[PDB]
Design a protein around this nucleic acid. Structure first.
Length: 88
DNA sequence: GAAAAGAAGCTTTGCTTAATAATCCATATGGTTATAATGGGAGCTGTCACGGATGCAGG
């Protein structure tokens, strides 16, 4: 379904903020322009801000859990250091 | 083949918020006090065994 399109969204976000290029995620319209030029596609077309908030909105809680769990896999070296000093 | 229906793509719009005028207030700094006002205080008090460096002295 659309869940796979969201998977490529967060994966491109993972590469994007992983390679020290941050400022293009927090602003939204330029980010959607970036996603449209790299050629992601939900239902045969480009991405609208309404369409973006729908596809983020129309979404299941367990799938969201799956997406953040998949997202945390690249950022493992940060989290091991993060929790090694919090084992109280 | 019609017709409701929902998205694509424009707009607004009530709300927010970051930039910036205004103001006030901590802060520094200095001055200025004209009778006279003339040597401190805890110091521990019940180690101790060695040891080397002064220290003093007579031959």
């Amino acid at each position: 379904k659309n869940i796979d399109t969201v998977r490529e969204i967060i994966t491109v976000a993972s590469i994007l903020i992983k390679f020290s290029r941050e400022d293009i995620v927090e602003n939204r319209a330029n980010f959607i322009a970036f996603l449209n030029e790299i050629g992601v596609t939900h239902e045969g077309r480009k991405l609208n801000q309404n369409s973006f908030r729908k596809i983020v909105s129309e979404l299941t809680q367990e799938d969201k859990k799956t997406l953040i769990d998949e997202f945390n896999e690249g950022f493992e070296g940060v989290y091991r250091y993060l929790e090694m000093y919090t084992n109280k």
